[PDB]
Structure formats: structure tokens, C-alpha cells
């Protein structure tokens, strides 16, 4: 295959969907919300440990 | 009471009659079978004891194909089989063929059926003759039929919605010839002749309806809408009722000058509809726009002599008065110095019904502006040189001569069109 063509199961790989999405702000907002929730959960776990 | 007999001569006449009768059936609720599940249909239809409505129409053609398309198509049970009259040989774009040799028996039978149809009418507002100036069938047979109608019926108002050759674009070669012949014929017979140009209607479809590929179906649909707006006051009541008899009284200053420019407004597709207010003033301005005119003839070159406006739908006399005042005060629109009023406004409460499969959208208001203006001499000026350019070499003259015509007929038609030109110049000048 084409060397430029990424292999499956790679950080570079994206399906045909998630390509042509053309939505950056929504993805960043969703990732920000997920990171905030994960950070709150981590703080809760550390609080429980302390 | 207000019956109007419709005549459709030639392929163009029949193909605009298809749209016209589809529109009338849709407006009156008449199913294509012939009957509806009042008395407003009496203008266009006569009801039988069985409840079935037949149109008071006559489809005349020397070619069998066009009429057989109707006989086999959707409205085969609606129209009368004998009312559809078909010839055996086409006129072959020969005015002489359609007026002197083939058309004799066909037009005699047409008068027979027309008399039978008029026998079913208590009153008779007039005739609506739809033909094509520029074809042997439409020109020759139509001229002969109009002459016979003038001879026998007499003072009945015959409105000829003629389709004239476009300035540059065309489909025929002897079109200037038979156009000049037909114009000479109908200058003295029709009461009100409405000029239509395929180029102008194509431009209307391209610019207003955004149709990059307009066709005869679209053109005929627009013409049908114009005629329905014209006849709406006969079938539906409204403030400022206008009649067929009132047209030529309020629009024809002199008998020779009876050719009419027609403009419909608004012309918008469904996608572009309901995006603008479409007020009475705006649609009146659009109707008076030169581009919306259904003839390739800029009104700015000439001067308006009369303008009859037919409004349909939610139209109020206050708004129509304001719009007409703005039109009069506008400098671009110029009326003749000898006509102070020059306006015949008539409102109707029935909005124009939308044909399924048409590109026109459902609009609560509509304007049909039919005007007498001296600018219309421009189209005659174009045909007068397109004719003589061939006539110098006597091209295609043998074809017309072979069916019982003379060079004298061509000379007389050319001289008559020149007289029409000079009459237009005289009325335009102070």
C-alpha cells in the first residue's frame, strides 16, 4: 500500500466518518468537558485517599 | 351569461390551450374527466344534464399529431371529440397553403362547430383566438377564420393572443413572410391583439423563474396565467369589475391601434417566494419593468397610451391608487401628452390558482398589465426589414405562389405594415 496511507489502529488513522466532519469548536468543547469531568473525578479519588 | 368561446389554431395555439384549459379546470375544480364533485364555469364550460362540464373550445389544426396528443392524453374525456378538429395535411409553414388551398374546408367546418358552440351560449362576451403568427396553420387558417368570424358574427369582440416572431432568435425561415401576411390580415379583423414573443418569455423564465432551460410548456403556462388573470373578472366578482367589452373601450384609442403589450407579475419560483413582501406597489413596479414585458420591445423607446391593470387576490383600492400614483409620478414611465389618465384599474377577489407542475408559486396578489403603447412599432420595424431583405431576392416566393397567391399580395402586406408604422409614428408624435 501507499506509504503515506496510515495503517489501521494508528493515532493518524481516521475513518471516512470523522473526516468531512468540519466541526472543530464542538469537538474541542466536548473534549474540554470530558477533561473537566475526569479531573474532578481524579480530585475526588485523591481526596478519598487522603 | 358571460360565455366566452375559445379558439386554438395551430400547434402553438393548441399547446397554449392545453395550459389554459388545465388552469381553468384547476380554478373551477373541474376534474379532467369532465365533471366536478357557482355558474362561474359558464364563461368557459357548459354543464350537461349528467353534470359533466365540457369547455366551449375549438382546437383547430391541419396536422393530426398535435390534436391526437390531446385525444390520447389526460383530457380525452373532457374535450368534445368533434370540437377537436384535425386536418390531413399540415400547412408546412406556408401562409398560402393554410389560407387558400388546405384551410378552406377546415375553416368551414370550424365555423360550423363555432356556430354550434355559440348556440349553447345565452350571452356571448366574445372569442379568444390563440394562434401563432409565424406558421402556415396559425397565420393562414387563423386569418381565414378571423375573417369569417368578422363577416358573420359581426361586432363580437375577438381577442387574438398572437405569438409573434422574436427579433433575433427563431425556429422558421419563412417566418417573416407569413408573419407579415398574417399581420396584414388581422390588422382589420381582431378587436384586441396581444403580442407575445418567445424570446421575451424565455428571458422572463430565465431571470425571474431561474429556469436555465425554459420550454414551450413553461411559456404556455405563463400565457395561460396571463389569460386567466385577464378573464378573472368575468368569472369571479370583485371591486372594480372589468369586462371584455370594457377592455377595448378603455384601451383602444383608435381602431387601427389595438396591439397590446402584456406583462404578468410577480414571476417567482417557490424557493424565492415568501422572501419579499410582494406588496401592491412592488408588484406594480415589477409589472411596469421593461424586463418583465412579454414582448422584446423596450417601452422606454415609445410612450404609453393606455394601461389596464388586472389585480387578483388581496388587493385594496387604496393600495392600487397609491401604486398607480407612484407610477404616474415616475419619470422613466412616460405617457403620451394627449392622454392624461391612461389608466384602467380593476381588482378581483380571486387569487390566481397555482397549476401543479408549474414553476409559479402561490402568491396572494397578482397583476396583469396590458398596455397600448407606441413602442410596439419597433417589432413591426424589425419584421418590415426582415421581410424585404428576402423579398428583394424573392426567396421562398415560389412556395407561396404555388398555393394560389400573387406578388401583389406580398406588396400589399408590406405596404400595409408600412402604413401601420406611419400610424404608430403619427400617434406617438404630438
Amino acid at each position: 500500500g501507499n506509504p503515506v496511507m496510515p495503517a489501521r489502529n494508528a493515532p493518524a488513522f481516521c475513518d471516512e466518518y470523522d473526516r468531512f466532519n468540519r466541526d472543530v469548536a464542538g469537538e474541542m468543547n466536548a473534549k474540554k468537558q470530558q477533561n473537566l469531568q475526569k479531573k474532578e473525578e481524579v480530585y475526588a479519588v485523591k481526596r478519598a485517599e487522603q | 351569461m358571460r360565455e366566452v368561446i375559445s379558439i386554438h389554431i395551430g400547434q402553438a395555439g393548441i399547446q397554449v390551450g392545453n395550459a389554459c384549459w388545465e388552469l381553468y379546470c384547476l380554478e373551477h375544480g373541474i376534474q379532467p374527466d369532465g365533471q366536478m364533485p357557482d355558474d362561474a364555469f359558464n364563461t368557459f364550460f357548459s354543464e350537461t344534464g349528467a353534470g359533466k362540464h365540457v369547455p366551449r373550445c375549438i382546437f383547430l389544426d391541419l396536422e393530426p399529431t398535435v390534436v391526437d396528443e390531446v385525444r390520447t392524453g389526460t383530457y380525452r374525456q373532457l374535450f368534445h371529440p368533434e370540437q377537436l378538429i384535425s386536418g390531413k395535411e399540415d400547412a408546412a409553414n406556408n401562409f398560402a397553403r393554410g389560407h387558400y388551398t388546405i384551410g378552406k374546408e377546415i375553416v368551414d367546418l370550424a365555423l360550423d362547430r363555432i356556430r354550434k358552440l355559440a348556440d349553447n351560449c345565452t350571452g356571448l362576451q366574445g372569442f379568444l383566438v390563440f394562434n401563432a403568427v409565424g406558421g402556415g396553420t396559425g397565420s393562414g387558417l387563423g386569418s381565414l377564420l378571423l375573417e369569417r368570424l368578422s363577416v358573420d358574427y359581426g361586432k363580437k369582440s375577438k381577442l387574438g393572443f398572437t405569438v409573434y416572431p422574436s427579433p433575433q432568435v427563431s425556429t422558421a425561415v419563412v417566418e417573416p413572410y407569413n408573419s407579415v401576411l398574417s399581420t396584414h390580415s388581422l390588422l382589420e379583423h381582431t378587436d384586441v391583439a396581444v403580442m407575445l414573443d418567445n424570446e421575451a418569455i424565455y428571458d422572463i423564465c430565465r431571470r425571474s423563474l431561474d429556469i436555465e432551460r425554459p420550454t414551450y410548456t413553461n411559456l404556455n403556462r405563463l400565457i395561460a396565467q396571463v389569460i386567466s388573470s385577464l378573464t378573472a373578472s368575468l368569472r369571479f366578482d370583485g371591486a372594480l369589475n372589468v369586462d371584455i367589452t370594457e377592455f377595448q373601450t378603455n384601451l383602444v384609442p383608435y381602431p387601427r391601434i389595438h396591439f397590446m403589450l402584456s406583462s404578468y407579475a410577480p414571476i417567482i419560483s417557490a424557493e424565492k417566494a415568501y422572501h419579499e413582501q410582494l406588496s401592491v406597489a412592488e408588484i406594480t413596479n415589477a409589472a411596469f419593468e421593461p424586463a418583465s414585458m412579454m414582448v422584446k420591445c423596450d417601452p422606454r423607446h415609445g410612450k404609453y397610451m393606455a394601461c389596464c391593470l388586472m389585480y387578483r387576490g388581496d388587493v385594496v383600492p387604496k393600495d392600487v391608487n397609491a401604486s398607480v400614483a407612484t407610477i404616474k409620478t415616475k419619470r422613466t414611465i412616460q405617457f403620451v401628452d394627449w392622454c392624461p389618465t391612461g389608466f384602467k384599474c380593476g381588482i378581483n377577489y380571486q387569487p390566481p390558482t397555482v397549476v401543479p407542475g408549474g414553476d409559479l408559486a402561490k402568491v396572494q396578489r397578482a397583476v396583469c398589465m396590458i398596455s397600448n403603447s407606441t413602442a410596439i412599432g419597433e417589432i413591426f420595424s424589425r419584421l418590415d426589414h426582415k421581410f424585404d431583405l428576402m423579398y428583394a431576392k424573392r426567396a421562398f416566393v415560389h412556395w407561396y405562389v404555388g398555393e394560389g397567391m400573387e406578388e401583389g399580395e406580398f406588396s400589399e402586406a408590406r405596404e400595409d405594415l408600412a402604413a401601420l408604422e406611419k400610424d404608430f409614428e403619427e400617434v406617438g408624435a404630438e
Partner: protein, 431 residues
């Protein structure tokens, strides 16, 4: 209900007519047996223009086959559609004309012409209304040209008002098949000018050029040339047989094409002719059809229109198409090539539209051009005829059949006069 009586003359005429009837039957869904198997109402709607109904569902073509040798019509009968024709319409002699127009027009055609006119009259009287007769044949062949001209004269005498259409295969410019081609062509053109109302000039070398350049075929036999001729022959009359958005019969075409009665020779072309390789890669659009139609390579006549001037031109389009598109395309062509169009005719285009395209094609368009380019074709034929007649080569063959030498001079004078008329309207100026 406007009937057409088809006649085939000579070997070339018989083969062309057989191919044409094959194509028309395929278009109307008629199998070689006469029965209808098309599954479409419009196909049977106007089938009476060409066919008559037998006792059953059989449809017999209104075709009349002529020859002086029986082998050609034996081949015609044994061909794919040989069994549709009524056997009574095969009129044959026993000794063929030896490529001798004199034999085919005076000696041997005289006996058979009585039977030919009898069959023609029988076919015409059965017709409800007759648009006219179409005769397919070849100029430059003995029986073909001779009997065709004689029959055209007889039918002109009998039915003056009825239309006469001719598909004549003029001898090719470069490669000539028979030696006596200039003689036969010169004699036949004199008859066609006087009698034929409408005539189409076809050249085998133009057909070879178009089928090798556009169709890009490798081994084009006479069948392919006959197929192109059949396509044009069908497309000219498809407006009679099918509904049209703007229909136009043969008389309408003749009226809008012929400016003056003697100038009735036309070069014809069919679009779209696409090679098998590029069939998908092309696009069927009205501009594309017009562009291919106005190309000189599309012309089936040897003469290229660039040298001459288009007196008139009819274009019969077929398919679901925009009349606005058609009119705009042809007006644009006229404006762009105003040099090639006659000035004293403001509109040189007769556009017709038919609702039914040919089988397999979404869109099609046949072209009939009356231009002064055919002047060079006639000039070349006369250039050969004069060279042969100066030394009177092969003149004794025609002289011994009982036609005067002065007939050659009269025919040459008439043909030169036609050339002069074409040149006069080529270089005529307005006002």
C-alpha cells in the same frame, strides 16, 4: 396518417432500403415477421406512415424494390428483414444494366417501368393521405440511376403536388468505383434537378471518412454506411411518426430549406456519432450535438461547407430537450459563423423538435444543409464528364441504346447552370 411510399433502386438503393427498413422496424418494434413486439403505444400510433396492416398483426412496409438483375433482391429477401416486404413489390428484370444509364433509362427500364408504376399506384391508392414518395438509389450506377430517374419522372407526371424525396449516392470524389460514374451522374443530375422536389447527396468517401474518424471503426463495410444513411432517413421523417414539441413534416422542411426551386440539393449529417471508446466519456447535451452537427466532418457529402455559404439549414432534434436551448444554440452558431451564412436571409435555421429519440440514444439530431458548397461536387463531376466526353470514351455504349449525343450536352449545360446558380447565391450581396 400522412403516408410515405418508399422505393429502392439498383443494388445500392436496394441495400440502403433494406437497412433503412430494418432500422425503422427496430424503431417501431417490428420484427422481421411484421408483428409488433415493442411494448409502447407511440410506436404503433403512427405506424401507418410506412406500414400497412395484413390480415393478422402483420405489418407490410410500403416499399417497392426495383432492379434489372435478380441477385440483388435475392440477397435483399435473404437478409435479416427480407420477409417483411410483400413479394408483389419486388420488380425485377432478367438482364441487369451494365452500369449503363442508357440501358436503365431507355432500353431495359422501359419494359419494367410499367410494372413499377403499377405497383407504385397500387401502394399510393391504398394510402389515406400521401405525403409523398422517397426514392433511395445511387448516382453512377446503371439500373439504379436510370430506373430511379425514369420512375421519378413518371411519378412527377402522375402526382405533381405530392412530395418527392431522393437519397442519391453521388459518385465519390477521390476513389471512383466504376468508370462510367461521371456519365451516369451527369445524366441523372439533369433529371433530379427537373423532377425531384427534395434531394440529398451522399458520398461513400465522406461516409468512410466519418466512420473512420468519428466512429473510429477499423473495417467499415457497406453495412455501416447503409446504417448511417438509414439513421438520417429515419431522423428526417421521425416528426411525422412521433409527437413533436415543434413538429415539422417533409413539406415544412422543403419549404423552409429550398429558397429557389432548382437549388434543392442538400448535404445531411447525423448526431451524435460517437466512437465506442468515447461513448461513456462524451456527454449528450444540446450544445454538444450542435457542435458536432456543424462540423464539416459530420457532413455525409464530400463538399465541405466551409468553402461555400449556408443558404438554409434545417435541424431536426429528437429527445426531451429545451426549445430555448435549441434556439439559443442555433442562433449562437449563426452569429459566430455569420461569414458562412447568407446575408439576405436573416434566419438560416429551421429547428424542429420531436419527442421520441432513437432507440439507445437519449438525444439525437439530423441535419439538412442547403449550401453553395455542393457547387464544388458538381464542378468535379463535370470536370470528369467533360474530360471523358471530349474524346467520347465509352460514348458508343450510350449511343447504341438510342439516346442522342445532344442529350449529353443538354445534361452538362443544365448541371453547369445549377453550378452557376449556386455560385450566384454564394456571392450575392444584400441590397
Amino acid at each position: 396518417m400522412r403516408e410515405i411510399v418508399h422505393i429502392q433502386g439498383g443494388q445500392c438503393g436496394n441495400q440502403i432500403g433494406a437497412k433503412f427498413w430494418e432500422v425503422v422496424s427496430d424503431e417501431h418494434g417490428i420484427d422481421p415477421t411484421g408483428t409488433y413486439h415493442g411494448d409502447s403505444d407511440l410506436q404503433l400510433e403512427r405506424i401507418n406512415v410506412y406500414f400497412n396492416e395484413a390480415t393478422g398483426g402483420r405489418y407490410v412496409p410500403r416499399a417497392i424494390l426495383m432492379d434489372l438483375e435478380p441477385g440483388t433482391m435475392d440477397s435483399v429477401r435473404s437478409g435479416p428483414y427480407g420477409q417483411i416486404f410483400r413479394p408483389d413489390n419486388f420488380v425485377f428484370g432478367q438482364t441487369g444494366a451494365g452500369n449503363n444509364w442508357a440501358k436503365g433509362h431507355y432500353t431495359e427500364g422501359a419494359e419494367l417501368i410499367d410494372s413499377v408504376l403499377d405497383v407504385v399506384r397500387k401502394e399510393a391508392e391504398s394510402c389515406d393521405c400521401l405525403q409523398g414518395f422517397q426514392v433511395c438509389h445511387s448516382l453512377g450506377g446503371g439500373t439504379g440511376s436510370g430506373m430511379g430517374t425514369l420512375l421519378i419522372s413518371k411519378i412527377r407526371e402522375e402526382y405533381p403536388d405530392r412530395m418527392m424525396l431522393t437519397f442519391s449516392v453521388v459518385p465519390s470524389p477521390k476513389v471512383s468505383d466504376t468508370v462510367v460514374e461521371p456519365y451516369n451522374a451527369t445524366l441523372s443530375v439533369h433529371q433530379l434537378v427537373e423532377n425531384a422536389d427534395e434531394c440529398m447527396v451522399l458520398d461513400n468517401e465522406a461516409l468512410y471518412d466519418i466512420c473512420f474518424r468519428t466512429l473510429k471503426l477499423t473495417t467499415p463495410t457497406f453495412g455501416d454506411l447503409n446504417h448511417l444513411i438509414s439513421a438520417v432517413m429515419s431522423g428526417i421523417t421521425c416528426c411525422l411518426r412521433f409527437p413533436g414539441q415543434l413538429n415539422a413534416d417533409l413539406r415544412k422542411l422543403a419549404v423552409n430549406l429550398i429558397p429557389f426551386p432548382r437549388l434543392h440539393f442538400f448535404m445531411v449529417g447525423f448526431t451524435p456519432l460517437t466512437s465506442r471508446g468515447s461513448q461513456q466519456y462524451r456527454a449528450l447535451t444540446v450544445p454538444e450535438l450542435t457542435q458536432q452537427m456543424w462540423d464539416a466532418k459530420n457532413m455525409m457529402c464530400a463538399a465541405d461547407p466551409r468553402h461555400g455559404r449556408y443558404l438554409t439549414a434545417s435541424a431536426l432534434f429528437r429527445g426531451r430537450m429545451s426549445t430555448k436551448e435549441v434556439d439559443e444554440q442555433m442562433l449562437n452558431v449563426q452569429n459566430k459563423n455569420s461569414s458562412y451564412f447568407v446575408e439576405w436571409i436573416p434566419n438560416n435555421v429551421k429547428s424542429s423538435v420531436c419527442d421520441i429519440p432513437p432507440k439507445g440514444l437519449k438525444m439525437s439530431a439530423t441535419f439538412i444543409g442547403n449550401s453553395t458548397a455542393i457547387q464544388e461536387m458538381f464542378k468535379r463531376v463535370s470536370e470528369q464528364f467533360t474530360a471523358m466526353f471530349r474524346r467520347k470514351a465509352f460514348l458508343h455504349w450510350y449511343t447504341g441504346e438510342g439516346m442522342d449525343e445532344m442529350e449529353f450536352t443538354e445534361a452538362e449545360s443544365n448541371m453547369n447552370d445549377l453550378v452557376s446558380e449556386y455560385q450566384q447565391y454564394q456571392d450575392a450581396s444584400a441590397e
